[PDB]
Amino acid sequence: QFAKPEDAVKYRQSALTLMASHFGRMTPVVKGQAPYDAAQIKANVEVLKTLSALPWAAFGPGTEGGDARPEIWSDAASFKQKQQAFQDNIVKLSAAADAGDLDKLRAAFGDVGASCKACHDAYFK
Amino acid sequence: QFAKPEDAVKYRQSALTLMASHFGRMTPVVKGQAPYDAAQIKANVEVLKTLSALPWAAFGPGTEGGDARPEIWSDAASFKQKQQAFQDNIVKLSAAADAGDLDKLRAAFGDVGASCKACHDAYFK
Ligand code: HEC
Ligand code: HEC
């Protein structure tokens, strides 16, 4: 869906920006600094679900650019493992949110954040 | 969820960028220049559904900035009517996609695009 590589870069950056707002805006809730409304969080995690599936298709072959370390395309199976592990940790966060189980939410949130950081460490310039 | 107004600007711009990729990538399909796969389009419109609900919350009071004409906050009911009409045209596009009805897709797509342009004309700098 991208006319030039720059379009893929702009798309993924925008997806990651959201996806990151929808994750990070829950930090006060997970820390207890903001109240926990199970329905609010269930709805927000559903948005995060959808967003978390979007960036990866915008790292097609030859869409090198942005802050994407070059190691992303030449090690394709390994980058895919990281996105799919991230994506699997998001399933666990959805399960916690859907259940209204705060303790499960906090644990799952930490796992998700570790998965963000793991990819950032291997693949962000 | 925004620490400063600039954060809201960055969020809405990113949401609008996606939302706009998910809309515009269907143009070749609506024109018949690309094949029509009903399931593909149903799934893409579902993504567009979700995205099309996101920008509006990032135009809170005092988040002036970006390419958002100042007329957005002082005429709040009217800006809300435009986003909700856009949002209603998206419901019609979902219905067309869900039904696998190509003719209904083309008509709904044109209505959506007109709603994008109408808001762009009243509120984009
Ligand atoms: C888990 C919820 C997160 C969060 C909060 C973020 N990421 Fe990543 N990310 C990855 C790569 C390769 C990039 C660079 C993209 C490019 O510039 O081409 C990024 C970038 C970001 C950003 C900045 C986006 C921007 O506006 O420029 C942010 C805010 C961000 N990330 C947060 C790679 C990955 C992953 C590889 C599988 C995973 C998982 C994540 N990121 C997860 C997260
Ligand atoms: C219907 C599907 C669309 C499409 C394809 C786009 N919009 Fe809009 N849009 C609106 C405003 C106020 C702005 C400025 C935001 C800001 O800068 O603060 C925009 C911006 C955009 C962009 C550019 C985003 C960026 O990266 O800077 C794009 C690509 C875009 N729009 C496309 C306002 C509205 C609406 C008011 C209710 C509606 C409806 C739409 N836009 C709809 C669409």
Side-chain angles (χ1 to χ4, degrees), chain A residues 2-125, chain B residues 2-125:
Chain A
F2 306 119
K4 291 171 182 170
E6 287 86 350
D7 300 312
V9 174
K10 185 166 188 26
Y11 179 100
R12 71 211 185 200
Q13 291 181 344
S14 284
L16 288 158
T17 293
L18 249 56
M19 179 186 98
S21 178
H22 283 279
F23 177 76
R25 71 180 57 194
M26 298 186 286
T27 301
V29 176
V30 162
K31 294 176 166 188
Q33 297 158 0
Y36 176 51
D37 175 331
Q40 178 186 31
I41 293 295
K42 181 181 179 182
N44 183 66
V45 173
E46 181 85 344
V47 172
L48 180 59
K49 175 177 181 198
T50 298
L51 296 169
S52 287
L54 301 182
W56 324 113
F59 296 87
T63 67
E64 275 79 358
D67 305 306
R69 279 186 59 191
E71 292 84 356
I72 294 171
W73 284 267
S74 57
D75 303 329
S78 291
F79 189 79
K80 188 175 172 188
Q81 275 296 294
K82 286 200 198 302
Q83 63 100 335
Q84 292 281 287
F86 166 72
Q87 293 192 281
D88 279 348
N89 284 257
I90 292 290
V91 174
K92 182 168 60 193
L93 186 64
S94 294
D98 283 357
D101 185 329
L102 176 63
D103 288 296
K104 295 150 179 304
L105 191 81
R106 272 207 319 169
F109 185 88
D111 292 344
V112 169
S115 293
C116 308
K117 181 174 189 309
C119 188
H120 173 275
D121 287 359
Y123 296 116
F124 183 99
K125 278 184 218 153
Chain B
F2 306 119
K4 291 171 182 170
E6 287 86 350
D7 300 312
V9 174
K10 185 165 188 26
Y11 179 100
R12 71 211 185 200
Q13 291 181 344
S14 284
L16 288 158
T17 293
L18 249 56
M19 179 186 98
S21 178
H22 283 279
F23 177 76
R25 71 180 57 194
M26 298 186 286
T27 301
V29 176
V30 162
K31 294 176 166 188
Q33 297 158 0
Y36 176 51
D37 175 331
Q40 178 186 31
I41 293 295
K42 181 181 179 182
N44 183 66
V45 173
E46 181 85 344
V47 172
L48 180 59
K49 175 177 181 198
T50 298
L51 296 169
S52 287
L54 301 182
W56 324 113
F59 296 87
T63 67
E64 275 79 358
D67 305 306
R69 279 186 59 191
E71 292 84 356
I72 294 171
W73 284 267
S74 57
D75 303 329
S78 291
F79 189 79
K80 188 175 172 188
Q81 275 296 294
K82 286 200 198 302
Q83 63 100 335
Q84 292 281 287
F86 166 72
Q87 293 192 281
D88 279 348
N89 284 257
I90 292 290
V91 174
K92 182 168 60 193
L93 186 64
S94 294
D98 283 357
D101 185 329
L102 176 64
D103 288 296
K104 295 150 179 304
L105 191 81
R106 272 207 319 169
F109 185 88
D111 292 344
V112 169
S115 293
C116 308
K117 181 174 189 309
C119 188
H120 173 275
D121 287 359
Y123 296 116
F124 183 99
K125 278 184 218 153

Short mmCIF file of all heavy atoms in Angstrom, two decimals, chain A residues 10 14, chain B residues 8-9 12-14 16-17 19-21 23-24 48 52 56 59 63 65-69 72-73 79 82-84 86-87 90 112-113 115-120 123-125, ligand 2:
data_model
loop_
_atom_site.label_atom_id
_atom_site.label_comp_id
_atom_site.label_asym_id
_atom_site.label_seq_id
_atom_site.Cartn_x
_atom_site.Cartn_y
_atom_site.Cartn_z
N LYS A 10 6.80 6.22 7.18
CA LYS A 10 5.83 7.12 7.82
C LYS A 10 4.69 6.30 8.46
O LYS A 10 4.24 6.58 9.58
CB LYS A 10 5.27 8.12 6.81
CG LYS A 10 4.37 9.16 7.40
CD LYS A 10 4.11 10.32 6.47
CE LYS A 10 3.36 11.37 7.27
NZ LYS A 10 3.72 11.20 8.72
N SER A 14 3.95 6.03 12.57
CA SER A 14 2.65 6.47 13.06
C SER A 14 1.97 5.33 13.83
O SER A 14 1.40 5.57 14.90
CB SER A 14 1.74 6.90 11.89
OG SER A 14 2.12 8.16 11.40
N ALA B 8 -0.71 15.54 22.00
CA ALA B 8 -2.01 15.34 21.34
C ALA B 8 -1.92 15.55 19.85
O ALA B 8 -2.51 14.83 19.07
CB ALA B 8 -3.04 16.30 21.96
N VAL B 9 -1.15 16.58 19.47
CA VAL B 9 -0.94 16.87 18.04
C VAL B 9 -0.26 15.67 17.37
O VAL B 9 -0.71 15.18 16.32
CB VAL B 9 -0.12 18.15 17.85
CG1 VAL B 9 0.21 18.34 16.37
CG2 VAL B 9 -0.87 19.35 18.45
N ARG B 12 -2.81 12.71 17.08
CA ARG B 12 -3.85 12.83 16.07
C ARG B 12 -3.30 12.76 14.65
O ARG B 12 -3.92 12.20 13.76
CB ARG B 12 -4.78 14.05 16.28
CG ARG B 12 -4.17 15.41 16.00
CD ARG B 12 -4.82 16.44 16.90
NE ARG B 12 -4.37 17.80 16.60
CZ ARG B 12 -4.47 18.82 17.44
NH1 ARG B 12 -4.93 18.63 18.68
NH2 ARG B 12 -4.05 20.00 17.06
N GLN B 13 -2.14 13.37 14.46
CA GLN B 13 -1.50 13.30 13.16
C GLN B 13 -1.17 11.86 12.76
O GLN B 13 -1.38 11.46 11.64
CB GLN B 13 -0.25 14.18 13.09
CG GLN B 13 -0.59 15.66 13.13
CD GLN B 13 0.60 16.55 13.05
OE1 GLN B 13 1.73 16.10 13.26
NE2 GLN B 13 0.34 17.82 12.79
N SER B 14 -0.72 11.07 13.72
CA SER B 14 -0.39 9.67 13.48
C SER B 14 -1.68 8.88 13.22
O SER B 14 -1.71 8.05 12.30
CB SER B 14 0.34 9.06 14.69
OG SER B 14 1.67 9.49 14.74
N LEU B 16 -4.52 10.02 11.97
CA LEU B 16 -5.03 10.46 10.71
C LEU B 16 -4.20 9.88 9.55
O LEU B 16 -4.76 9.49 8.56
CB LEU B 16 -5.16 11.99 10.70
CG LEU B 16 -6.30 12.51 11.60
CD1 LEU B 16 -6.08 13.96 12.01
CD2 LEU B 16 -7.73 12.30 10.95
N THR B 17 -2.88 9.81 9.73
CA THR B 17 -2.02 9.17 8.77
C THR B 17 -2.44 7.71 8.55
O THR B 17 -2.53 7.25 7.41
CB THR B 17 -0.56 9.29 9.20
OG1 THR B 17 -0.15 10.66 9.14
CG2 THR B 17 0.37 8.46 8.28
N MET B 19 -5.31 6.05 9.66
CA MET B 19 -6.64 6.03 9.13
C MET B 19 -6.63 6.31 7.61
O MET B 19 -7.31 5.55 6.86
CB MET B 19 -7.47 7.05 9.89
CG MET B 19 -8.91 7.22 9.48
SD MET B 19 -9.69 8.62 10.40
CE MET B 19 -9.58 9.93 9.20
N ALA B 20 -5.83 7.30 7.12
CA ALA B 20 -5.77 7.68 5.68
C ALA B 20 -5.14 6.65 4.69
O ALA B 20 -5.51 6.56 3.51
CB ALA B 20 -5.09 8.97 5.53
N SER B 21 -4.16 5.92 5.17
CA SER B 21 -3.59 4.76 4.48
C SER B 21 -4.62 3.62 4.33
O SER B 21 -4.67 2.99 3.28
CB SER B 21 -2.36 4.25 5.23
OG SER B 21 -1.85 3.11 4.58
N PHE B 23 -7.87 3.89 4.30
CA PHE B 23 -8.86 4.33 3.37
C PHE B 23 -8.33 4.30 1.94
O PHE B 23 -8.84 3.62 1.07
CB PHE B 23 -9.41 5.71 3.76
CG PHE B 23 -10.41 6.26 2.78
CD1 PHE B 23 -11.71 5.78 2.75
CD2 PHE B 23 -10.07 7.23 1.87
CE1 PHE B 23 -12.65 6.26 1.83
CE2 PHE B 23 -11.03 7.72 0.94
CZ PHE B 23 -12.29 7.21 0.94
N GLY B 24 -7.24 5.04 1.70
CA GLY B 24 -6.72 5.23 0.41
C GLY B 24 -6.19 3.99 -0.30
O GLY B 24 -6.21 3.93 -1.55
N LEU B 48 -9.99 0.11 9.57
CA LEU B 48 -10.37 1.49 9.38
C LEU B 48 -11.44 1.98 10.36
O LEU B 48 -11.37 3.11 10.84
CB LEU B 48 -10.81 1.69 7.94
CG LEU B 48 -11.26 3.11 7.55
CD1 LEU B 48 -10.12 4.15 7.78
CD2 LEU B 48 -11.82 3.17 6.11
N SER B 52 -10.79 5.09 12.73
CA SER B 52 -11.62 6.27 12.48
C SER B 52 -12.26 6.84 13.72
O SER B 52 -12.76 7.96 13.71
CB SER B 52 -12.69 5.93 11.44
OG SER B 52 -12.10 5.83 10.16
N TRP B 56 -10.36 11.94 17.38
CA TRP B 56 -11.19 13.04 17.88
C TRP B 56 -10.91 13.38 19.31
O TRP B 56 -10.94 14.56 19.71
CB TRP B 56 -12.71 12.82 17.54
CG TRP B 56 -12.81 12.17 16.20
CD1 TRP B 56 -13.25 10.91 15.95
CD2 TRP B 56 -12.30 12.66 14.96
NE1 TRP B 56 -13.05 10.59 14.63
CE2 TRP B 56 -12.42 11.64 14.01
CE3 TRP B 56 -11.66 13.87 14.57
CZ2 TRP B 56 -11.99 11.80 12.71
CZ3 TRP B 56 -11.22 14.00 13.29
CH2 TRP B 56 -11.37 12.96 12.38
N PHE B 59 -8.19 16.07 20.05
CA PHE B 59 -8.46 17.50 19.88
C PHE B 59 -9.14 18.06 21.15
O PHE B 59 -10.04 18.86 21.07
CB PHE B 59 -9.35 17.80 18.67
CG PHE B 59 -8.75 17.45 17.32
CD1 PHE B 59 -8.88 16.17 16.80
CD2 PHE B 59 -8.11 18.39 16.54
CE1 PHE B 59 -8.37 15.82 15.57
CE2 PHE B 59 -7.59 18.05 15.31
CZ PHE B 59 -7.76 16.78 14.79
N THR B 63 -5.52 21.89 23.09
CA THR B 63 -4.57 21.15 22.19
C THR B 63 -4.42 21.77 20.80
O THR B 63 -4.07 21.09 19.86
CB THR B 63 -4.93 19.65 22.07
OG1 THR B 63 -6.17 19.50 21.40
CG2 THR B 63 -5.02 18.95 23.40
N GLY B 65 -2.79 23.44 17.81
CA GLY B 65 -1.50 23.18 17.19
C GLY B 65 -1.60 22.41 15.88
O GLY B 65 -2.69 22.12 15.34
N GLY B 66 -0.46 22.05 15.32
CA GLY B 66 -0.46 21.33 14.07
C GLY B 66 -1.15 22.11 12.99
O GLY B 66 -1.06 23.35 12.93
N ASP B 67 -1.79 21.40 12.06
CA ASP B 67 -2.51 21.97 10.92
C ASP B 67 -4.00 22.11 11.25
O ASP B 67 -4.80 22.31 10.34
CB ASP B 67 -2.35 21.15 9.61
CG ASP B 67 -0.93 20.90 9.22
OD1 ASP B 67 -0.20 21.88 9.12
OD2 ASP B 67 -0.51 19.73 8.95
N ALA B 68 -4.36 22.05 12.52
CA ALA B 68 -5.74 22.19 12.99
C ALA B 68 -6.14 23.64 13.07
O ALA B 68 -5.43 24.42 13.70
CB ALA B 68 -5.88 21.57 14.36
N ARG B 69 -6.98 24.04 12.11
CA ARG B 69 -7.41 25.44 12.09
C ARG B 69 -7.99 25.74 13.44
O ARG B 69 -8.56 24.88 14.07
CB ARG B 69 -8.43 25.70 11.00
CG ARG B 69 -7.86 25.89 9.63
CD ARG B 69 -8.99 26.28 8.69
NE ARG B 69 -9.65 27.52 9.13
CZ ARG B 69 -10.80 27.99 8.62
NH1 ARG B 69 -11.44 27.31 7.68
NH2 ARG B 69 -11.31 29.14 9.06
N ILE B 72 -11.74 24.76 14.99
CA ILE B 72 -12.10 23.49 15.63
C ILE B 72 -12.71 23.57 17.10
O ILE B 72 -13.74 22.98 17.30
CB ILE B 72 -10.92 22.49 15.51
CG1 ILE B 72 -10.66 22.08 14.05
CG2 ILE B 72 -11.14 21.27 16.39
CD1 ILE B 72 -9.37 21.26 13.83
N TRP B 73 -12.13 24.32 18.08
CA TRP B 73 -12.59 24.31 19.53
C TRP B 73 -13.75 25.29 19.94
O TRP B 73 -14.51 25.08 20.90
CB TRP B 73 -11.39 24.69 20.40
CG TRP B 73 -10.42 23.57 20.53
CD1 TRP B 73 -10.38 22.62 21.53
CD2 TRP B 73 -9.36 23.23 19.61
NE1 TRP B 73 -9.34 21.73 21.29
CE2 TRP B 73 -8.70 22.10 20.14
CE3 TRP B 73 -8.91 23.78 18.41
CZ2 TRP B 73 -7.66 21.47 19.46
CZ3 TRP B 73 -7.85 23.18 17.76
CH2 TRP B 73 -7.24 22.04 18.29
N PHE B 79 -17.88 21.04 14.66
CA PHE B 79 -16.81 20.01 14.53
C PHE B 79 -17.27 18.59 14.94
O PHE B 79 -16.99 17.66 14.18
CB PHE B 79 -15.53 20.41 15.29
CG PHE B 79 -14.34 19.50 15.01
CD1 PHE B 79 -13.61 19.65 13.84
CD2 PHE B 79 -13.98 18.52 15.91
CE1 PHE B 79 -12.55 18.82 13.56
CE2 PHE B 79 -12.86 17.71 15.64
CZ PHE B 79 -12.17 17.85 14.46
N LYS B 82 -19.37 17.05 12.29
CA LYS B 82 -18.60 16.55 11.16
C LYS B 82 -17.93 15.24 11.45
O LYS B 82 -18.04 14.30 10.66
CB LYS B 82 -17.58 17.58 10.68
CG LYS B 82 -18.29 18.68 9.94
CD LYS B 82 -17.35 19.42 9.06
CE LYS B 82 -17.96 20.77 8.68
NZ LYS B 82 -19.26 20.61 8.01
N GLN B 83 -17.25 15.14 12.58
CA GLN B 83 -16.64 13.82 12.94
C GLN B 83 -17.71 12.73 13.06
O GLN B 83 -17.48 11.63 12.61
CB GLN B 83 -15.62 13.77 14.14
CG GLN B 83 -16.12 14.13 15.51
CD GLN B 83 -16.44 12.97 16.41
OE1 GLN B 83 -16.75 11.87 15.94
NE2 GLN B 83 -16.43 13.23 17.70
N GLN B 84 -18.87 13.01 13.67
CA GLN B 84 -19.91 11.97 13.81
C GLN B 84 -20.52 11.64 12.43
O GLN B 84 -20.78 10.48 12.15
CB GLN B 84 -20.95 12.38 14.86
CG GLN B 84 -20.39 12.42 16.34
CD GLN B 84 -20.29 11.03 17.01
OE1 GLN B 84 -21.31 10.44 17.38
NE2 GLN B 84 -19.05 10.54 17.22
N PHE B 86 -18.84 11.75 9.55
CA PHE B 86 -17.76 10.93 9.00
C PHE B 86 -17.88 9.50 9.56
O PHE B 86 -17.87 8.52 8.82
CB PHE B 86 -16.41 11.56 9.29
CG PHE B 86 -15.29 10.64 9.07
CD1 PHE B 86 -14.89 10.25 7.79
CD2 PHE B 86 -14.58 10.15 10.17
CE1 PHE B 86 -13.83 9.32 7.65
CE2 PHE B 86 -13.55 9.27 10.00
CZ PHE B 86 -13.22 8.84 8.75
N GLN B 87 -18.01 9.44 10.88
CA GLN B 87 -18.11 8.20 11.60
C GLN B 87 -19.33 7.33 11.19
O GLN B 87 -19.26 6.12 11.12
CB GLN B 87 -18.05 8.55 13.10
CG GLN B 87 -16.63 9.12 13.55
CD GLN B 87 -16.47 9.19 15.06
OE1 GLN B 87 -16.97 10.10 15.71
NE2 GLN B 87 -15.75 8.24 15.62
N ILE B 90 -18.55 5.89 7.84
CA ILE B 90 -17.73 4.69 8.07
C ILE B 90 -18.63 3.48 8.40
O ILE B 90 -18.35 2.39 7.92
CB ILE B 90 -16.64 4.94 9.14
CG1 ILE B 90 -15.55 5.93 8.68
CG2 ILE B 90 -16.01 3.57 9.50
CD1 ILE B 90 -14.66 5.36 7.60
N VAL B 112 -17.65 8.41 2.10
CA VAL B 112 -16.60 8.62 3.08
C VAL B 112 -15.61 9.67 2.62
O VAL B 112 -15.28 10.60 3.38
CB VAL B 112 -15.85 7.31 3.52
CG1 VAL B 112 -14.64 7.62 4.32
CG2 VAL B 112 -16.84 6.37 4.25
N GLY B 113 -15.10 9.55 1.40
CA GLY B 113 -14.15 10.52 0.90
C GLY B 113 -14.70 11.94 0.91
O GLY B 113 -13.97 12.90 1.22
N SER B 115 -16.81 13.08 3.02
CA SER B 115 -16.81 13.50 4.43
C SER B 115 -15.43 13.89 4.91
O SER B 115 -15.29 14.86 5.65
CB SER B 115 -17.37 12.45 5.37
OG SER B 115 -18.75 12.19 5.21
N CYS B 116 -14.40 13.18 4.44
CA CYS B 116 -13.01 13.61 4.73
C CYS B 116 -12.78 15.02 4.21
O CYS B 116 -12.26 15.89 4.91
CB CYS B 116 -11.99 12.71 4.04
SG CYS B 116 -12.06 10.91 4.23
N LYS B 117 -13.16 15.24 2.95
CA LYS B 117 -12.93 16.52 2.29
C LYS B 117 -13.73 17.64 2.95
O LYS B 117 -13.20 18.75 3.10
CB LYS B 117 -13.36 16.41 0.82
CG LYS B 117 -13.13 17.68 0.02
CD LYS B 117 -13.45 17.48 -1.48
CE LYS B 117 -13.02 18.67 -2.34
NZ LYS B 117 -13.55 19.90 -1.76
N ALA B 118 -14.97 17.38 3.35
CA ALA B 118 -15.79 18.39 4.03
C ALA B 118 -15.12 18.89 5.31
O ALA B 118 -15.10 20.10 5.59
CB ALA B 118 -17.19 17.86 4.32
N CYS B 119 -14.59 17.98 6.12
CA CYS B 119 -13.90 18.39 7.33
C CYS B 119 -12.61 19.12 6.99
O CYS B 119 -12.33 20.21 7.53
CB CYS B 119 -13.75 17.26 8.35
SG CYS B 119 -13.12 17.92 9.84
N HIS B 120 -11.84 18.58 6.07
CA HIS B 120 -10.62 19.22 5.62
C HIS B 120 -10.84 20.67 5.18
O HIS B 120 -10.07 21.59 5.59
CB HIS B 120 -10.01 18.40 4.49
CG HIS B 120 -8.84 19.06 3.83
ND1 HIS B 120 -8.99 19.97 2.80
CD2 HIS B 120 -7.51 18.93 4.04
CE1 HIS B 120 -7.79 20.38 2.42
NE2 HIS B 120 -6.88 19.77 3.16
N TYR B 123 -11.75 22.77 8.49
CA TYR B 123 -10.91 22.70 9.70
C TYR B 123 -9.41 22.43 9.57
O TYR B 123 -8.74 22.36 10.60
CB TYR B 123 -11.57 21.69 10.65
CG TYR B 123 -12.94 22.15 11.12
CD1 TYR B 123 -14.07 21.44 10.80
CD2 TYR B 123 -13.11 23.33 11.81
CE1 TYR B 123 -15.33 21.85 11.23
CE2 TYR B 123 -14.37 23.75 12.21
CZ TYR B 123 -15.48 23.00 11.91
OH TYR B 123 -16.74 23.43 12.30
N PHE B 124 -8.92 22.19 8.38
CA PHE B 124 -7.50 21.94 8.12
C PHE B 124 -6.89 23.23 7.60
O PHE B 124 -7.42 23.82 6.69
CB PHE B 124 -7.31 20.79 7.12
CG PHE B 124 -5.86 20.43 6.84
CD1 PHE B 124 -5.28 19.34 7.49
CD2 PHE B 124 -5.08 21.16 5.95
CE1 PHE B 124 -3.97 18.99 7.26
CE2 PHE B 124 -3.78 20.80 5.72
CZ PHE B 124 -3.22 19.72 6.36
N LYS B 125 -5.78 23.66 8.21
CA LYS B 125 -5.05 24.90 7.91
C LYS B 125 -4.40 24.77 6.54
O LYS B 125 -3.31 24.16 6.46
CB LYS B 125 -3.95 25.13 8.97
CG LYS B 125 -4.41 25.76 10.28
CD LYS B 125 -3.18 26.01 11.18
CE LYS B 125 -3.51 25.73 12.65
NZ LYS B 125 -2.43 25.31 13.59
C1 HEC C 2 -11.10 10.46 5.70
C2 HEC C 2 -10.72 8.98 5.57
C3 HEC C 2 -9.89 11.36 5.98
C4 HEC C 2 -8.67 11.30 5.49
C5 HEC C 2 -8.13 10.36 4.39
C6 HEC C 2 -7.88 12.33 6.14
N1 HEC C 2 -8.66 13.02 7.03
FE1 HEC C 2 -8.13 14.67 8.06
N2 HEC C 2 -7.54 16.05 9.39
C7 HEC C 2 -8.40 16.86 10.15
C8 HEC C 2 -7.67 17.87 10.86
C9 HEC C 2 -8.23 18.94 11.78
C10 HEC C 2 -6.28 17.61 10.51
C11 HEC C 2 -5.11 18.35 11.07
C12 HEC C 2 -4.56 17.68 12.34
C13 HEC C 2 -3.38 18.39 12.95
O1 HEC C 2 -2.40 18.65 12.19
O2 HEC C 2 -3.43 18.76 14.16
C14 HEC C 2 -6.25 16.52 9.59
C15 HEC C 2 -5.12 15.98 9.06
C16 HEC C 2 -5.10 14.95 8.15
C17 HEC C 2 -3.93 14.35 7.57
C18 HEC C 2 -2.51 14.77 7.91
C19 HEC C 2 -2.01 14.19 9.22
C20 HEC C 2 -0.57 14.44 9.52
O3 HEC C 2 0.25 13.50 9.43
O4 HEC C 2 -0.19 15.61 9.82
C21 HEC C 2 -4.30 13.41 6.69
C22 HEC C 2 -3.44 12.48 5.85
C23 HEC C 2 -5.75 13.37 6.73
N3 HEC C 2 -6.20 14.33 7.61
C24 HEC C 2 -6.54 12.57 5.94
C25 HEC C 2 -9.75 16.71 10.22
C26 HEC C 2 -10.51 15.69 9.70
C27 HEC C 2 -11.91 15.44 9.95
C28 HEC C 2 -12.75 16.36 10.84
C29 HEC C 2 -14.01 15.77 11.48
C30 HEC C 2 -12.25 14.34 9.23
C31 HEC C 2 -13.60 13.63 9.11
C32 HEC C 2 -11.05 13.90 8.55
N4 HEC C 2 -10.00 14.76 8.82
C33 HEC C 2 -11.02 12.83 7.69
C34 HEC C 2 -9.91 12.41 6.96
#
